[PDB]
Design a protein around this ligand. Structure first.
Ligand SMILES: Nc1ncnc2c1ncn2[C@@H]1O[C@H](COP(=O)(O)OP(=O)(O)OP(=O)(O)O)[C@@H](O)[C@H]1O
Ligand SMILES: Nc1ncnc2c1ncn2[C@@H]1O[C@H](COP(=O)(O)OP(=O)(O)OP(=O)(O)O)[C@@H](O)[C@H]1O
Ligand SMILES: Nc1ncnc2c1ncn2[C@@H]1O[C@H](COP(=O)(O)OP(=O)(O)OP(=O)(O)O)[C@@H](O)[C@H]1O
Ligand SMILES: [Mg+2]
Ligand SMILES: [Mg+2]
Ligand SMILES: [Mg+2]
Lengths: 1030, 102, 103, 103
């Protein structure tokens, strides 16, 4: 509901007067204290989140009007105030009560609070000080109780709600750093009636882009039907007083011989724009190579403008879009629509912006109609995605030729006439953010102070821009290459272009022919490129030709190829090389900005000309912080959703930890995380709205959600690399392997937890292997690490690597290591190393490939130039002696861990308990005799067989019992059902719950053999003695 | 590794016992809350979030990690000679045969 | 021979073209190579492991041709072979000649 | 080493029952006899003195082809005990051989 607005200097918690009509027809009569919510509409891409207030009846207020304290928004009503808001009285008067509220207080009041004797006395003192009441007063967040004294630091449960001042905890924090001095209630920076006396001629003031579009409803005055938004300007009230007219008719802006007519309105008070500056939309700003400061003057003759609109001359500005075949039709239609307005004004040298939708290029909505054909409301469904300009040159003068400075265009007299293509420079990003104004998909705003590589590119391009007045052909090609996809190359290029104001050509791999290129593909490619470029370059100064994914077109010679097929490759290479340099000297300032995903495959004939190659690393910790700060920003989330409830993040989030916890992820991954978080938050919001609980007026992202969304993103990545779905073993099952447990912990996790002491290039001993008798945990430990440590887990399925041909095993090994090296925190599990790394050069062997492969292992595993040692290697075998020594060395496999038979009743009971853990054990009997009765030749795996056998016996008992029950039932009835039918017709869940009684154990233990003989065990004992005894 | 393990074991309580003066707290209306230390920590973390900064100061190397001979000798005790003792003779023989001939 | 080239330029009469290292595992000779690769300033080509071989018929010969061609066309460099046995076993072979033609 | 990997590898399979047989089993590697795989070892015995009757009666009374209520041509007395004892315990297939020989 829309309510008229006015402000007062009352207290923050003073009741808000509301008109009788609303209080009666909508206000709840049963409520002792009525509460409503207000939204302030402000110049931005969305409405503000609602703020709650307490209201009371007031007969003095006119129809649908409200009065509120201006101090609730940190200002005073000295300047013109806003005249309306959106309001709704809460149905059922539902409001939440905050359990705790955090306040920041000044030193003097905190000293007074200690001086105050008692807790209750202090509570009453605060009651009187800031009008805070139990279950009556409602608090908000980011608000100030009084200028420079106290501020609401935080509110945990909700941004606003009631306070149980009797019990709600009040976290009072002393302002030890005097931050509260920064608080400022929209106060004036002093004020003078005449800072300069009699300065009626002109005033000099700053010009900067208006940050967002303007909606007519927010305008204080009442302009006419048409010809308003194209010449708007907004300023502070006092600036109007310095001009001697409040929101005067027309103003003029004059510098460098360019004079334009503008209309100046008052900037409305609540907005937080800067002081003493002109805020204008891009339409007027574009006309200038504007200086930071600019002078303005009165122009009364503007009210007497002349409609001399006959035979106007229009021109399409140079640009990438203007030269496209399909767009041209919609461009024409939208230009005719723009000039269809009755009273638009215009003057020579003006740039007129024209927005339109990119994807409506083919949707001819309807033909022209005799009557009742209009676009106004029909367009509301779609919002624009691309922008162009038009450059205006001349117009008729007629008998009114005495003046030609400014004129109107009338559809009843104006006709569409155009000349050839002109040229002019774009607008540098530093001066006006056009995307921001038109809500486009904003290019990421890099910050050169932080990102290294972008500075190089921008410097090169700006050098080629500045050399225009030096006038030499120094322009140089630039090639971008990256180690991985999705590192924002095209984004940073677009950033540079928009920053330096350089027209950008975006050719890409949407080519015409790439398969069976013999069918004149070379022509279809190069002719297309030449046609696309030649229609833009003669009208762009400077210009940039950007070739995305150039890697997949300028392919290099293949090792194995058809002798004649490669000829086409050579031809395309050479012709591309030629057209590379042709533009260099056929036009001034041309820069060739190519992109490649792997520079190794670019043709040397083409690359050799290249003189600047920037590698674009995956963003390190510092950058991800900024990237998060961007994607989480208000001007990003709130965009493109059109959800009726604005969006925002809760302030309790932490960039610093988030960044560190998102290591290795590329920017696209980051955006994916943000999007998923947004989804989950919206789902939570609608779930709460479905419930009967209190409904927040905003949806708040929470770090508690990001913490798991990042995990899901990482799991997605882990699926990308194709890792197996290892079972979910837990770190607790491992039992009597404490020594090896700690040994593993000291290497896999110790240099990974608190990553500061090990943060160095040292040889961090990424090698480890288990060896010993069969069945003592070697694979289980790996299975546990695979999921309990969050390290990527690669499985080498025994002799997986070995292969048919001579050299494909040597390719498989290298591919495995390369892919693992792609994801730095990764593990390699060489299961049964025997099959892959036999002793080198034995006489009892043939073929020799087993030697080549082990040599390749010795090479790639350790080698030289090794870095980023996070690649662990875990190996296992039944017997190591078949391995070659050259592996049994530090750097590859330092300690050989002998996970021997526990030989110890402590360990035996530990493993028996760990095996029995997760199923019920009847406690009438003690298990220790199971350790005492087994001889120590029994083994971790055969204790597993013992447990499973005992279980199976005890559950066979239950099977027999249920068989007896079903037979009895069949005897009672006509024997009409079997056991299977019994289990769907009837159920006895509690009866089926098998519980093992150790009598079963004492039965089973008599029947199970040891997994190894003394003959084998002595062998492994001797092996250990050799390797460990020393 | 053994020395850093011992240092970390000894340093566990170093950062827990001392008081924190980076922010001052009044603690009014604290009745009805069983948690005391965790609530103080959460208040301090809230204030730090409001006043978060990324810069950090350096520290002396010796009090981060240090090498001592007492643990070094014990580490030497747990020997791990790479060369196979039974294979050193064979390797010596083959090396000599390579050196003298071809 | 690059550091003191006027001393080494004269008298092309007698010279030795390459060196062979061998010893017990862990005796730093890989690190010797690494240091010589980087401090010397002389270019260094790291054909580590038997990557020379290739699936297709007699591809090894062409591969070595390319390798030595790059070595020559790069300014003076060291061709680093390690685990040499993997690339040059004894003359005798029961298998195809694709593993000894390379020698 | 492949079979072991596919049997109890990290990515362990399930719902598959490996059933093995041979005459001389201990020449299977001990790591394939480890309980958890091939874990239950089951002897079969040919002597079964006085139990050979049970098998004989089975094989003679085998009715596999339901089209007829019998395949072997039994006689009325069915005093199989005499021949069963007379068999002297050759094997298990011996009795089927006797059956077919007599038929
Ligand atoms: N560093 C970044 N900061 C912000 N957004 C980024 C960044 N990198 C990529 N993006 C996002 O990715 C899209 C455009 O960049 P994109 O990932 O397509 O780059 P690219 O260089 O063309 O990649 P590639 O060649 O690997 O496909 C946009 O949605 C943009 O927001
Ligand atoms: N100490 C133990 N702790 C936990 N589980 C164990 C232990 N000993 C045996 N087991 C169980 O018995 C099996 C032994 O798995 P293990 O990791 O020893 O296999 P492996 O490496 O394939 O063995 P092998 O030495 O026969 O190649 C697993 O099913 C495991 O759950
Ligand atoms: N001068 C040196 N003397 C001894 N050890 C050294 C020396 N320089 C470095 N080291 C360390 O000891 C190791 C020396 O052995 P290294 O691993 O280099 O052997 P390698 O030549 O690759 O052997 P192989 O191919 O037989 O396995 C180095 O990896 C390094 O960690
Ligand atoms: Mg791309
Ligand atoms: Mg195993
Ligand atoms: Mg080596």
């Amino acid at each position: 509901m829309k309510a008229s607005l006015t402000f007062s200097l009352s207290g923050i918690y003073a009741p808000c007067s509301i008109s009788r009509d609303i209080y009666l027809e909508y206000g709840d009569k049963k409520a002792e204290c009525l509460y409503g919510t207000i939204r302030l509409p402000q110049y931005g891409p969305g409405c503000t989140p609602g703020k709650i207030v307490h209201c009371v009846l007031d007969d003095s207020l006119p129809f649908c009007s409200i009065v509120v304290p201006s101090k609730l928004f940190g200002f005073m009503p000295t300047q013109p105030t806003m005249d309306f808001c959106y309001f709704e009285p809460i149905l059922d008067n539902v409001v939440p009560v905050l359990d705790s509220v955090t306040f920041l207080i000044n030193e003097q009041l905190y000293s007074k609070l200690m001086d105050l004797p008692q807790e209750m006395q202090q509570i009453q003192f605060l009651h009187y000080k800031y009008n805070i009441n139990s279950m009556e007063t409602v608090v908000h967040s980011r608000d100030i109780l009084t200028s420079g004294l106290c501020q609401i630091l935080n509110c945990s449960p909700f941004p606003q709600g009631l306070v149980d001042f009797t019990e709600t905890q009040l976290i009072l924090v002393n302002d030890t750093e005097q931050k509260l001095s920064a608080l400022k209630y929209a106060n004036e920076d002093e004020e003078y009636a005449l800072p300069k006396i009699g300065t009626n001629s002109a005033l000099s003031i700053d010009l900067e882009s208006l940050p967002c579009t303007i909606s007519r409803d927010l305008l204080r005055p009442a302009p006419h039907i048409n010809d308003d938004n194209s010449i708007y300007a907004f300023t502070d009230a006092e600036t109007l007083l310095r001009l001697d007219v409040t929101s005067g008719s027309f103003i003029t802006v004059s510098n460098m011989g360019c004079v334009r007519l503008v209309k100046l309105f008052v900037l409305l008070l609540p907005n937080g724009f800067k002081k003493r500056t002109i805020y204008a939309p891009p339409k007027i700003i574009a006309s200038f190579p504007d200086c930071s400061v600019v002078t303005i003057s009165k122009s009364n003759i503007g009210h007497t403008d002349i409609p001399i609109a006959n035979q106007v001359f229009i021109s399409r500005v140079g640009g990438w879009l203007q030269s496209q075949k399909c767009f041209q039709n919609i461009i024409l239609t939208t230009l005719k629509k723009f000039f269809s307005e009755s009273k638009r004004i215009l003057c020579q040298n003006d740039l007129i912006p024209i927005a339109f939708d990119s994807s409506m290029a083919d949707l001819n909505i309807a033909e022209e109609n005799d009557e009742s054909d209009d676009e106004d409301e029909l367009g509301q469904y779609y919002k624009n995605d691309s922008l162009v300009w038009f450059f205006v040159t001349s117009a008729e003068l007629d008998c009114f030729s005495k003046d030609n400075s400014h004129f109107i265009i009338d559809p009843n007299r104006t006709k569409l006439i155009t000349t050839n293509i002109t040229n002019r420079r774009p607008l540098p990003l530093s001066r006006s953010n056009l995307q921001r104004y038109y809500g486009f998909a904003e290019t990421f705003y890099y910050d050169l102070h932080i990102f290294p590589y972008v500075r190089q590119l921008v410097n090169i391009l700006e050098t080629s821009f500045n050399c225009s007045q030096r006038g030499i052909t120094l322009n140089a090609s630039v090639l971008l290459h990256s180690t991985t996809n999705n590192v924002g190359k095209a984004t940073m290029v677009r950033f540079a272009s928009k920053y330096l104001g350089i027209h950008l050509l975006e050719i890409d791999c949407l080519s015409l022919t790439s398969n069976s290129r013999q069918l004149d593909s070379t022509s279809k490619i190069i002719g297309y490129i030449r046609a696309k470029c030649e229609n833009v370059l003669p009208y762009a100064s400077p210009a940039v030709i950007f070739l995305a994914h150039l890697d997949s077109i300028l392919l290099d010679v293949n090792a194995n190829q058809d002798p004649e097929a490669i000829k086409l490759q050579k031809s395309i290479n050479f012709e591309m090389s030629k057209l590379l340099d042709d533009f260099t000297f056929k036009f001034p300032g041309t820069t060739f900005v190519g992109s490649v995903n792997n520079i190794d495959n670019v043709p040397s004939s083409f690359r050799s000309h290249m003189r600047f190659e920037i590698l674009v690393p995956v963003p390190s910790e510092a950058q991800r912080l900024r990237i998060f700060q961007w994607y989480l920003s208000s001007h990003e989330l709130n965009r493109d959703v059109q959800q009726k409830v604005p969006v925002s993040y809760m302030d309790n989030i932490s960039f610093s930890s988030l960044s560190s916890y998102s290591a290795g992820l590329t920017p696209l991954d980051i955006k994916s995380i943000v999007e998923t978080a947004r989804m989950t938050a919206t789902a939570r919001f609608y779930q709460e709205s479905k419930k009967c609980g209190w409904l927040p007026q905003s949806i708040l992202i929470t770090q508690e959600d990001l913490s798991k969304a990042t995990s899901k993103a990482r799991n997605e990545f882990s699926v990308s690399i194709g890792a197996p779905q290892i079972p979910n073993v837990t770190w607790d099952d491992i039992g009597g392997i404490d020594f090896v447990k700690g040994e593993i912990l000291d290497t896999i996790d110790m240099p990974l937890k608190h990553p500061e002491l090990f943060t160095s290039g040292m040889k961090k001993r990424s090698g480890i292997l288990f060896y010993g008798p069969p069945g003592t945990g070697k694979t289980l430990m790996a299975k546990a690490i695979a999921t309990n440590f969050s390290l990527n887990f690669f499985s080498v399925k025994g002799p997986e690597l070995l292969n048919m041909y001579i050299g494909e095993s040597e390719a498989n090994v290298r591919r495995v290591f390369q892919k693992a090296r792609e994801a730095k925190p990764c593990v390699i599990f060489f299961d049964q190393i025997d099959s892959v790394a036999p002793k080198r050069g034995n006489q009892g062997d043939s073929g020799g490939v087993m030697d080549r492969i082990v040599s390749q292992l010795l090479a790639e595993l350790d080698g030289m130039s090794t870095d980023a040692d996070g690649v662990f290697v875990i190996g296992a075998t039944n017997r190591p002696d078949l391995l070659d020594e050259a592996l049994l060395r530090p750097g590859r496999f330092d300690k050989l861990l002998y996970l021997g038979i526990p030989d110890t009743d402590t360990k035996q009971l530990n493993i028996l308990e760990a095996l029995t853990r997760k199923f019920v054990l009847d406690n009438d009997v003690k298990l220790i005799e199971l350790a005492k009765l087994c001889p120590f030749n029994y083994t971790g795996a055969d204790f597993y067989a013992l447990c499973s056998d005992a279980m199976l016996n005890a559950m066979s008992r239950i099977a027999r019992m249920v068989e007896k029950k079903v037979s009895q039932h069949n005897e009672l009835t006509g024997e009409n059902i079997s056991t299977r039918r019994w289990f769907d017709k009837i159920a006895t869940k509690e009866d089926t719950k098998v519980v093992v009684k150790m009598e079963d154990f004492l039965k089973a233990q008599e029947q199970l053999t040891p997994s190894v003989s003394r003959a084998e065990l002595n062998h492994y004992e001797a092996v250990r003695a050799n390797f460990e005894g020393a | 590794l053994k020395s850093v393990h011992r240092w970390l074991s000894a340093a566990d309580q170093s950062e827990v016992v001392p008081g924190n003066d980076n922010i001052e707290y009044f603690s009014i209306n604290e009745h009805g809350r069983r948690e005391e230390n965790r609530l103080r920590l959460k208040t301090l973390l809230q204030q730090d979030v409001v006043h978060e900064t990324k810069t950090s100061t350096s520290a002396a190397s010796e009090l981060t990690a240090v090498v001592t001979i007492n643990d070094l000798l014990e580490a030497c005790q747990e020997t791990k000679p790479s060369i196979s003792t039974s294979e050193l003779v064979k390797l010596r023989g083959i090396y000599d045969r390579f050196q003298k001939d071809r | 021979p690059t550091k003191y080239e006027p001393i080494f330029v004269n008298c092309p009469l007698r010279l030795r073209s390459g060196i062979l290292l061998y010893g017990y595992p862990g005796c730093g000779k890989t690190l010797l190579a690494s240091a010589v690769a980087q401090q010397c300033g002389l270019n260094f080509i790291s054909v580590k492991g038997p990557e020379i071989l290739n699936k297709f018929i007699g591809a090894s010969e062409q591969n070595i041709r390319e390798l030595f061609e790059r070595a020559q066309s790069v300014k003076p460099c060291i061709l680093f072979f390690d685990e040499f046995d993997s690339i040059a076993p004894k003359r005798g072979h029961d298998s195809t000649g694709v593993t000894d033609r390379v020698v | 080493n492949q079979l072991l990997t596919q049997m109890d590898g990290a990515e362990g399979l399930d719902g598959v029952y490996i059933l093995a047989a041979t005459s001389r089993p201990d020449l299977i590697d001990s790591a394939l006899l480890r309980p958890g795989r091939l874990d239950k070892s089951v002897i079969c015995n040919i002597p079964t003195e006085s139990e050979r009757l049970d098998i004989l009666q089975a094989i003679v009374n085998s009715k596999d082809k339901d089209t007829g209520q019998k395949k072997f041509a039994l006689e009325k007395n069915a005093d199989l005990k005499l021949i069963a004892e007379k068999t002297a315990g050759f094997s298990g297939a011996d009795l089927q051989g006797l059956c077919y020989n007599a038929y």
